[PDB]
Amino acid sequence: IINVKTSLKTIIKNALDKIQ
């Protein structure tokens, strides 16, 4: 199992954090 999906959401979070 590869939890890559959540790591991709981490990119979304890191991306959002730049705005917020």
Residue 2 backbone dihedrals phi, psi, to 5 degrees: -120, 120
Experimental technique used?
NMR
Half-sphere exposure of 3 (CA within 13 A, CB side): 3
Tokens (6 digits) for 5:
């999906």
Alpha-carbon distances, residue 14 vs 1, 5, 6 (angstroms): 23, 14, 12
